[PDB]
Ligand binder design. Sequence first.
Ligand SMILES: Nc1ncnc2c1ncn2[C@@H]1O[C@H](CO)[C@@H](OP(=O)(O)OC[C@@H]2O[C@H](n3cnc4c(N)ncnc43)[C@H]3OP(=O)(O)O[C@H]32)[C@H]1O
Ligand SMILES: Nc1ncnc2c1ncn2[C@@H]1O[C@H](CO)[C@@H](OP(=O)(O)OC[C@@H]2O[C@H](n3cnc4c(N)ncnc43)[C@H]3OP(=O)(O)O[C@H]32)[C@H]1O
Ligand SMILES: Nc1ncnc2c1ncn2[C@@H]1O[C@H](CO)[C@H]2OP(=O)(O)O[C@H]21
Ligand SMILES: Nc1ncnc2c1ncn2[C@@H]1O[C@H](CO)[C@H]2OP(=O)(O)O[C@H]21
Lengths: 433, 432
Amino acid sequence: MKLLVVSWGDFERWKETKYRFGGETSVGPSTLPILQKVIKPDWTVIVLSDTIGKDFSSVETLREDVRNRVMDFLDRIGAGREVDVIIAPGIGEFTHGSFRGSAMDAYYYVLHALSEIIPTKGDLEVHFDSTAGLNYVTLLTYRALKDLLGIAAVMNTVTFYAYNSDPFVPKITKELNINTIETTMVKPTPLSEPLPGFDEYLCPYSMERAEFVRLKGSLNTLKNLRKEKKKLEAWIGSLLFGLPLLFLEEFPDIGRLESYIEELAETWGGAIAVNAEEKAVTRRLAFGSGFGTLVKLLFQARITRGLLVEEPYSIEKLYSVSDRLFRGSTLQRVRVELGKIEDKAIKYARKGAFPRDIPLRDFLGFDAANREVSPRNVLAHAGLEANVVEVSMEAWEPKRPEEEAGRHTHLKYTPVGLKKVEDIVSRALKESH
Amino acid sequence: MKLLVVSWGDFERWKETKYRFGGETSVGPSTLPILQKVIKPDWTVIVLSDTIGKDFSSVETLREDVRNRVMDFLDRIGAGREVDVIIAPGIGEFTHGSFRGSAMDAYYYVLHALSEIIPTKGDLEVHFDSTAGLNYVTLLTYRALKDLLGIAAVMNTVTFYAYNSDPFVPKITKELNINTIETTMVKPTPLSEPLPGFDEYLCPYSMERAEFVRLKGSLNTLKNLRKEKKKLEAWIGSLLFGLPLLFLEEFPDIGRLESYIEELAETWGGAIAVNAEEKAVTRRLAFGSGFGTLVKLLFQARITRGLLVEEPYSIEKLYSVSDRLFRGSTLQRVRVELGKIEDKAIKYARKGAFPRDIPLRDFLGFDAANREVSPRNVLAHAGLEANVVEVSMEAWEPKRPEEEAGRHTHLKYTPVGLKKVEDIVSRALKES
Ligand SMILES: Nc1ncnc2c1ncn2[C@@H]1O[C@H](CO)[C@@H](OP(=O)(O)OC[C@@H]2O[C@H](n3cnc4c(N)ncnc43)[C@H]3OP(=O)(O)O[C@H]32)[C@H]1O
Ligand SMILES: Nc1ncnc2c1ncn2[C@@H]1O[C@H](CO)[C@@H](OP(=O)(O)OC[C@@H]2O[C@H](n3cnc4c(N)ncnc43)[C@H]3OP(=O)(O)O[C@H]32)[C@H]1O
Ligand SMILES: Nc1ncnc2c1ncn2[C@@H]1O[C@H](CO)[C@H]2OP(=O)(O)O[C@H]21
Ligand SMILES: Nc1ncnc2c1ncn2[C@@H]1O[C@H](CO)[C@H]2OP(=O)(O)O[C@H]21
């Protein structure tokens, strides 16, 4: 999968010039044609500001006006129509009309937009062009792209190239070169934020206190997320800290996450006041960081959903999941911790013994010294702590028990144990933020 | 410590307007005065492109010319004394001069300049105004800030705010708001890339390839890196993988790194041709990723220099280092691994036994036929692998050995063990 992403300002105001890139030359007002010629991307994404729109009879007429103008410009230049146009909510008071709202809305909106576009399976070659973009939307677009590609890199190889052209001086210019200003092997960065307080999902930009309170108190998301908050943070921590059993047991419901994001996005959309005569858009609600954390969480869940299996979890499964989610000292520590439980199950098998619903402490042979569940022991032992995990060996007829024990050995958290682990991982995730 | 950084273009062409920010107002051509008023920074950094230069007599008369017109402008709207001016290398064909080179030189130059300004002790509150610079110079300045602050965040609390003003649209503008476009607590990100091949430190832009090879051959930096590359990657791995004894034993020579960076820097500068009659600057060398890695490596060393304890390396000292350097599962991993050696040391102390210069495997009482040093055992056991570490307990008269054993029990790698750990950690950093 090759992806081309370009950040555009007022594309209509650009002058004709010549562009050098990768042994090709191009006449025209935009880099997109030559970019598409040289790179030959599988898909193109154009990101520009609302503030180019000149129709205020509705919000849907404003997006469609900007879209048509972009499609018309794609015909003017050699550009293909295989593209997604993200119309970002931009700020400023212009001659053709006024746009008020939180500046940060552009980031959350583009993050949301790209989280529905960037494929969640297979490798990713991403190309980002900033040659004639607005400074702040290009920063926020750049930021939103890197935040999702960081999560994508957990499961797949991701390569990021950025471009910018030589600056344009009028009539002095002859052939502007398109420079490569970044070539990056994107580092795997799983989500490492907790879900924030319920003030930080939607905030009031230009709205009376009581009307915001009503909208806020109308949201099913905030209500449902109050009692789900701990389980989701436990799941975020499972990737961050190397807890493969918690990853499987706490795997979130993608349907509910979709539902939470859809609702917050619809509410934000519904609160955009478009006054038709005086030519003015007011975004009466602002997106908060909690919206962003939800978009990243859903995306990470989509990226890792191929690993989830049904409830009996074998040692062999925990190995294969771990080898995909984890790297460096984290992966090697998880393999050593699982191995210790494996070597014990091999021993049990050679004696023709196959325990059922046995605490891991009783399985491994533990003193009656320490039954209290500590952060130290939960985080240092890949979450496979002896007082919270239950083991089951499914009886078989051994011949080569060293290779058969992992398939027949299953680990699960006790109802009480799971709740103790959720508290520790949730607290650890907030303490590291 | 509070730090303001601004990305500036042709600051002279700026028209007078008024700005709002944090319940305050200000009238002037730039936002620096009101940002300074509301934020009250302890220090301010201005990043400019050198592409506003006009007098092409030499390199030092371009950076002179640009610096003059900046210091005049800072006095005109009172930006004060507490200001560093970074004149980054820009490219483009302009009305009063031509500037040819790698676009990415602006990143490596700003990265190098910021690495000398950002304080390496204490917490950091960083403010970044992107209002008005060259698109790509502002982007590379932002990237250069985040890359360095990520390393700072390993040891100190780091919060980063970004701003962009409402677009100045000259016919209709009455005032412009300074909008917060970012507010983030910066996540701790240790350096996590190996040192590249000796082609990726300085690269030819417009230099004949025969001349490059000649000058590449004359650099005492690349010859010294031949020896030290693997020892430096071992240290990079120590932070990333939680290997506290390797962090201390491989701790890099800050002075030596300064001089490597200084030689690549002034060799780059020395290859900038200035043609006064044609009015053309040409940067015939470009900085490579390896110059970037060295700058980040030197900064990470400065950030963590406080943790290089006096020898010998006691369990007590190793806990103290680890408690500062590691977080999450990595920290708890290291505490449990050091705890195993401590509990053993306590056992020995209670029996009036004080083993001297004994392999860790003998100290812990290991079986035979597990003498092979694996990646798995080096990385899973916080680098305290039983076949590469040597233990010494300095003899004492114990009273409460549970408290005393940690201070009197010292660990080092054997010379043979160290090179195996270097090979494994270097290899592991490359596969990453
Ligand atoms: N006192 C000041 N004097 C002069 N400039 C100031 C001052 N204070 C702040 N600035 C900012 O400094 C940058 C240079 O003037 C400006 O920043 P930015 O607005 O981000 O500039 C980017 C260009 O605005 C252009 N575009 C002009 N029309 C509109 C428009 N109607 N919808 C959105 N963008 C517009 C964009 O089209 P493109 O891609 O050709 O170039 C961009 C100014 O907002
Ligand atoms: N076909 C095209 N038609 C129109 N623009 C194009 C086209 N292709 C590329 N562009 C670029 O797209 C942005 C919008 O026009 C421009 O780049 P941007 O970085 O946004 O430049 C904006 C201003 O150029 C100014 N400044 C002009 N001289 C120099 C200079 N020599 N040293 C530093 N800055 C310069 C900057 O000073 P400030 O802070 O007032 O605002 C910037 C253009 O260079
Ligand atoms: N509370 C605890 N104290 C010490 N070791 C533990 C604890 N919980 C788990 N472990 C060890 O983590 C491994 C995976 O479950 C397993 O190997 P072990 O060393 O036999 O004891 C377990
Ligand atoms: N090759 C190895 N195989 C198994 N365990 C090891 C090895 N090397 C080190 N360890 C264990 O790492 C800990 C810190 O040295 C220490 O505690 P242990 O579990 O007694 O054995 C050691």
